[PDB]
Amino acid sequence: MELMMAIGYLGLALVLGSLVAKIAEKLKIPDIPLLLLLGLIIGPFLQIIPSDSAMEIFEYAGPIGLIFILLGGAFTMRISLLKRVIKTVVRLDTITFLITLLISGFIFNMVLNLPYTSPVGYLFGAITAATDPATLIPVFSRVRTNPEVAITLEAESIFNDPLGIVSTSVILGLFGLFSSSNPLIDLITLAGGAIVVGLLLAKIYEKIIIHCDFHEYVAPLVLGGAMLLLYVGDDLLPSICGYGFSGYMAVAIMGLYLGDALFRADDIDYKYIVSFCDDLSLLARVFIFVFLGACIKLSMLENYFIPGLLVALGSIFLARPLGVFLGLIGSKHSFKEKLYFALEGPRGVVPAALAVTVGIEILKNADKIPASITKYITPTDIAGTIIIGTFMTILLSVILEASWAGMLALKLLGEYKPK
Amino acid sequence: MELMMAIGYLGLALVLGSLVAKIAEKLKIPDIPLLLLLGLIIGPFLQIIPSDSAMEIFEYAGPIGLIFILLGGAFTMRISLLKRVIKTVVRLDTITFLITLLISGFIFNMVLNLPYTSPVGYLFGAITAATDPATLIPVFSRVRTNPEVAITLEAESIFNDPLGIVSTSVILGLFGLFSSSNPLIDLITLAGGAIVVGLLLAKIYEKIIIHCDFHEYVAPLVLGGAMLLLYVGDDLLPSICGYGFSGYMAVAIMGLYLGDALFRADDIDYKYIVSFCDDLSLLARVFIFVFLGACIKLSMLENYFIPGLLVALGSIFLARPLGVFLGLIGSKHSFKEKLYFALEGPRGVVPAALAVTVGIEILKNADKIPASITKYITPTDIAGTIIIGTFMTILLSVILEASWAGMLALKLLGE
Ligand SMILES: [K+]
């Protein structure tokens, strides 16, 4: 709880992290795995930053950083250009999503000898189901590939960033909460509520920004505006209704529609936000990945190294492609194209943040409220397996992408038959 | 369950503060007073945010944002321009600062019937004596002033913020029961150390940043380095070598040397830093002023409104003038210019932040306060009077200086 300690660790993380990411850019290497390696170094390996401390810091700086990425990911692109391929986008972002998390659940259960009905694995998949846009952002921009593919991937990524949280949020209820009577109910409540309220405040902010020239004063407006969405979203509203919506998805929706409203209409206030959030997103990017590599326990790491790695392989090579094929069985896309989408989309920062947040929320709450069937496995090793599994998933997917990009892009974008 | 609610209140402060700031910017009036009024509105008046909870959040986010503000002015300041008026600046942050402090504290003690040696008054002065550049900078250029007084007042207003904090921490040591070391020792310790380590990290960062184009990645690098300096100075190092170390002044120094070096080396990485800090420094500047108005309790107002008022005027019309004149007693400037320096020294962000910090530091860690200075005045009354006093001081100084700025510049700085 030592604030100065937290500031110190965050400081070292930001310094060494920024340096590392800079080196990564200087060598065209993805920053992510290097950040993770650093996290492991200063984490268990050197014991500069202990686990519990990192957990307590992340308990505070978690949602804050998470609110940044959603914003930055919502302003990086707009939805006025999706009208061409929005169908493929939606199907790939919903059906492929659910299927992927399901199969990944099967794998996660079948690996750790957990029952195939274990909510643990399904939680893991729900976390890892979302992909990372900024990861594939340089690797498509430098290519400037067939715009369909590019914007399809961007749309899928940005749109799956919130749902993953929502999916994770719903499944967590099974592990013990104030209600969680039925997952579908809270899914509708969260999604629909976030859509409604988020779009409400989106319209409000739209009209309130257009009529003036806030300029530099836009930053405190949206950020705090997003901050309000969390209180009203997760803490406050249940106190008066029990139900509610995911504040994060509400933030994503609000910021997205707001960006597109600041782009359909043309306000100069727009250009600040993007440049603001992008710089703001970069902090949370560096901050989360390093702390993910610190929350690992050396013993737990050695215990679940091999299985998690194998789980990751199941996700990348089996889950993702299968979900792609099954989600796009009625598409106008080539087999080589579907295969492209399959071996493309990697995971990133959202599954990391969600992983650690799940770990701490379980350890802090499920210690008091452990589901019986689940309690047969120590919540300790639940959080351990989820966190390390997500870790190796991120790592493996990212490096695999780093070796995939060029070769696959050339070898799979060849045909494009004209009708 | 405190976290999400803290996010809520803080976010509300950010939104409402933003809107208010825009309103003020439109009506050609400063944002600060309206922000304080807003804080009072959602504070005691509407009771949207309980004072205890406000102070509770400020315990966390307070020190955080304080790094932003200090980082803000740091990069805006460049050294190569000061060399012509630096002799004036040095005095404006040394002797003038000390005198303003001693006199403001003197009057503060005299008002509430406290002995002229009561550390409470001098604490108030320590908090108050720091002039703010964020209210001078948008105003100075608009009124087409001479360059030198603009550069001068900017330099003073910037250099004050660290020295205000340092002095605030030093005097705080006297409010420490279990130990009361030599003031001068702590002063030279914190200051000198800040200079040293500041220059060190600023040199490292100089080479690192100059060598390659960091672009956006300066933000975590610099902020992290800043974050790093506080933990060393205000936690680790004293737990190790025993002797203290100021983090804030070190941070400010670092921003100064680094910024000036990058500006001198024409490294475009400089701007990427400035854009980042300016926004952050704007974020907390809103967050600070709002919470100050919320930390105040209704009782504090209905028991210390008028006393804090009288104290405020003393700081503005008696303290700072005498400080300026006596500081520049041998200067070769002009009487009109001296009066201009005197009548333009708004108390801004830093005095507010220090007022809240000290406020919670005293109110919470109350029982272990020395009884010598407690017998005269209740610690609750101490915190309340310092907070209110700083509040009235800031409001009055900003409003008066802003309303009189034009006429002041008109009939003074024409040599
Ligand atoms: K450079």
Numbering used by the authors:
A (entry chain B): 1 to 419
B (entry chain A): 1 to 415
Task: Show passages lifted from the paper.
MjNhaP1 has 13 transmembrane helices (TMH), referred to as H1-13. MjNhaP1 is inhibited by the Myc-His-Tag at pH 8 but not at pH 6.
asymmetric unit were refined to 3.5 Å resolution. Detailed views of the MjNhaP1 x-ray structure. Glu154 in H6 interacts with Thr76 in the interface helix H3. Arg320 forms an ion bridge with Glu156. Nevertheless, changing N160 to alanine renders MjNhaP1 inactive. closely resembles the x-ray structure of MjNhaP1 rather than that of EcNhaA. inward-open and the EM structure the outward-open state. inward-open with a sodium ion in the binding site.
